[PDB]
Ligand binder design. Sequence first.
Ligand SMILES: Nc1ncnc2c1ncn2[C@@H]1O[C@H](COP(=O)(O)OP(=O)(O)OP(=O)(O)O)[C@@H](O)[C@H]1O
Ligand SMILES: [Mg+2]
Lengths: 390, 727, 47
Amino acid sequence: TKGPDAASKLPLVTPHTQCRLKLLKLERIKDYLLMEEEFIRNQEQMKEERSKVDDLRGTPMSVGTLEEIIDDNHAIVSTSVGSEHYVSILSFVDKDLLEPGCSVLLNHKVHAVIGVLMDDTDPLVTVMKVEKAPQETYADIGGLDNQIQEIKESVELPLTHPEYYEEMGIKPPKGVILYGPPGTGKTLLAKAVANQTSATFLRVVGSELIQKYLGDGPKLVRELFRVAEEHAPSIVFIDEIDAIGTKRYDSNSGGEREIQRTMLELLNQLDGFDSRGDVKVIMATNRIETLDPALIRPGRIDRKIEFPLPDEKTKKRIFQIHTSRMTLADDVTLDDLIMAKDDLSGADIKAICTEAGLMALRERRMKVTNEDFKKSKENVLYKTPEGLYL
Amino acid sequence: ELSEEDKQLQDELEMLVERLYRPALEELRRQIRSSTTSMTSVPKPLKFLRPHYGKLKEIYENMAPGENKRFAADIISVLAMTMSGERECLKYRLVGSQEELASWGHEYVRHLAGEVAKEWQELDDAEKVQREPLLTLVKEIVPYNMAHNAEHEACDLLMEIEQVDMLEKDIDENAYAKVCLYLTSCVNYVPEPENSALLRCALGVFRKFSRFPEALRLALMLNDMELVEDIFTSCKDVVVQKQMAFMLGRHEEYEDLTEIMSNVQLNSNFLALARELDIMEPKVPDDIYKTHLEDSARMNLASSFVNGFVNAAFGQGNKWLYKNKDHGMLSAAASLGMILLWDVDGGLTQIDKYLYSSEDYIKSGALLACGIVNSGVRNECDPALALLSDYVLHNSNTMRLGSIFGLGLAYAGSNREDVLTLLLPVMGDSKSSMEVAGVTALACGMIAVGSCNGDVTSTILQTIMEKSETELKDTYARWLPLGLGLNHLGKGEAIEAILAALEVVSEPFRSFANTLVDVCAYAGSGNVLKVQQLLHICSEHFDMGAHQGVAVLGIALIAMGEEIGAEMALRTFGHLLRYGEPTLRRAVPLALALISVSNPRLNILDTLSKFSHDADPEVSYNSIFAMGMVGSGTNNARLAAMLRQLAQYHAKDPNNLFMVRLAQGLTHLGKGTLTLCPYHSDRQLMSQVAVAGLLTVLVSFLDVRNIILGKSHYVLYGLVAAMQPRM
Amino acid sequence: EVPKEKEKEKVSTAVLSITAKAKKKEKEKEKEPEPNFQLLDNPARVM
Ligand SMILES: Nc1ncnc2c1ncn2[C@@H]1O[C@H](COP(=O)(O)OP(=O)(O)OP(=O)(O)O)[C@@H](O)[C@H]1O
Ligand SMILES: [Mg+2]
């Protein structure tokens, strides 16, 4: 329960089109940043008893795991060898931080209690922690307005307006799936939440909760959710949950049962016996028909958001987004692609724009043309018999 | 690659450069058809005549007038703008009689504009003769820009190194959205008085297009009351004149122009919008609190403050006022007058009834009630002026201490000579007491509102010239600098003389004087050199404290425009309190509050909370009041919840509980109907109204232990003077 | 001679990109032979 961590993001100069206004704004960023760096360097360069006490402290402090504190100055600790000891307790510890399972610090020679290390989170989870601020705010999310509204109600509003719900006793949703075809914005709508959310964001990948050591997966999951609850009123983004989410079956192998165990621990965390704090789960998947009702349940996953292949208006707005930063030719009408009802994803629109720019560059030009868009679509698109209907 | 036809063209170029001169000029210049090509980059002749660049340049050097030497300069200069060949050859080409650019491309136009710019920077005030041809150039280019919608680039040329009027005057019509908003942003971020240059440039654009309810607000950014009347003069349409009068008040047919300017009916508008979504409800403190969800005079003060901050100006007292114990001062009488804000009608009656009453704590409160009620509304029949001018003239505290702030409340932001003559002679206060002198300076400055009034500046200067060595460095003598700062706002570099005059003051003091004068000066505009000065003056370690405090408040005040700057300043202040001395830590919350008053963003809320439960009670008080100021006039959620958690944590801490309950009262302040935010218009006005109140509040809270937990409390009602409606 | 302990000086103001501009604006607005003898005393430190 340390409190929210979130991420540090510098301000975003509003202009994108190459402009002296953009230059001026970005030089404003530069000058304040240089000023911060100055203050740091200046003050920290321009500008006893505890020193000797910490010297007495064993220099190569080891880490054990406390077990069954006894008395006031004699606590039992362990070691990373399977052995354990009835070690002494010095006068340097704050005390009251020593609880069973606590990763304690110990002296190399004396093997006493010389610390508590109330900071031990597994590397496999701290690396997954998010501290960058990916610049994907809710401006490049063409259309998808209903999905963004739902996700905003789920994630933002019980942080920036915790009065609507308390006014009427209702409690905010705890989980949201984003499910759909290959390329719709299910990950952009997570990136933008990371951007505008002042709460900690936690990457997660389903293929990351499957661990080699038997029983380690349903401990990594506990570590993940304990870090989420302890460290922040946060958000946990399990991308590609179909990596562990498949329906539980009887199975006849060890690995499948272990994966199912990881699922069960995830479910116990989402809605177990005890409770859940202010951790909001955002899950992503390409197929929702291949998941366990256990995790698709509306107690752990209170909202489900389809991401259907964007319609005509959304597709228009997506070309708008992904060509805005390009030198367009006046002879280009961004409707030839719109009108055709060929399955076009948001990623497909992005690839069309990129490929079109490339064809122009090959034509020795730096501004798109209608023929270039036509060739780009034709050479980008990847993939009922006639007359069976009508 | 070099396709066969491409190599044939290359060989044609080789023969052309190896070989009398008329055909050479003709075909070499026509080969710029590649650049004129509407659909192409990489102009082949450019970069095909790369090895010949030196040969062509030396030929031009060893060239003389005649049939040649005229059109070869075009090719020389295009190969130049590709590589080398600066404006000397550019303008030699142009004198070669080709300025049209029609036979050249948008690329060459932009390159020419940049080249002209960079020669202009390279040059100084000397050799200005070359400028005039270059001015004719810029004049010839800009129409091309307004043709091909390169409005950003045209405005770039205009803003370049200086200010320009010809273009935005001749910028056509009905396509001014860019020259309006984009130049408004450039203005918002300019570092110099060529800010004001771009200000009246945009104003002139509006005037030329006869639609200036944006030069309306630009008038205030232009610190020129003369320009204010100049804009007011035309006002050809009474319909828009009405809106202009309303805007002026918030910041032919003479019957109602002055009435709207003075806002004799703003109370009516506010009450009508209150009826809209009525919240009219005389209340009880606990409901603003939630004590059920968990009689000291300190609790009396806290309850009165919360009740007033919430029900301000709703027209709803001695019975509950009577509970006084020493510090049980005129706080609650001022609270009642404030709950009666802008209600002169019943204000006269109630304040008279409660002025014909008991000792100072009931008459000084009545005078402050009159003033605070009159704040924001003016009339020809001056209200409370007679009482202020006649009563309470004797040398003493309490009485004048409240009366002068009441007069400031009545007529702040007016610069009226009558009240100036009332208050300046009365400023003489060596006869009277020290806090009285401070509040007199407070009112004088709050009326000056940056008027640069020589008389009031002289009064403050002579008052500070009157020096008692021990009195200066004890407490309660900093409002002389405060009044000086209020008298001088954002006038630019026109403060050096005042600084030199003040440089005579004693060394340990006058750090506050200089810093507060400087910050009340240029601010909101944003000057990187100035904020550098502020940060450095913070950064000198002293093994003074209030000097860094004023520096911090100044960083806040200066970084109140650009939101980009505000966020970077949030970062800087986090660093400051992290690697900072206790004085610096105490000052940081004030700066956060000024950055985001009544705009409770989670980042500031989180940072202040994390710094709240501090070992220094002063730090804790600053942080919790910062919470109150960020949440002021918003009813924001979870601020009250976390704040109640903070209170329960500090259950038995008297001062902490009082101040945190005050923060809750700020949180529920005005029930959302009033906000302390400066920048009333387009979030782009360093509003002379309520900036004085906010700055006074922050200066006072720079030291909370001595003044706030002392013998004065009028800071809160100064913050109320800053209050303004949100409807 | 005693080494005069110098004050702990800082780094320069760094280029805020209008520092030089401001300085230029302010500036514009403002606009024994050694002898060949010793004559040593009677006890002479003659090297
Ligand atoms: N509405 C949108 N606007 C712009 N780009 C979009 C939009 N929706 C999707 N994209 C594109 O999506 C790409 C990222 O992949 P996306 O989030 O769509 O994948 P997904 O299939 O939903 O999820 P996952 O990454 O878990 O496979 C980005 O390149 C972005 O261009
Ligand atoms: Mg995705």
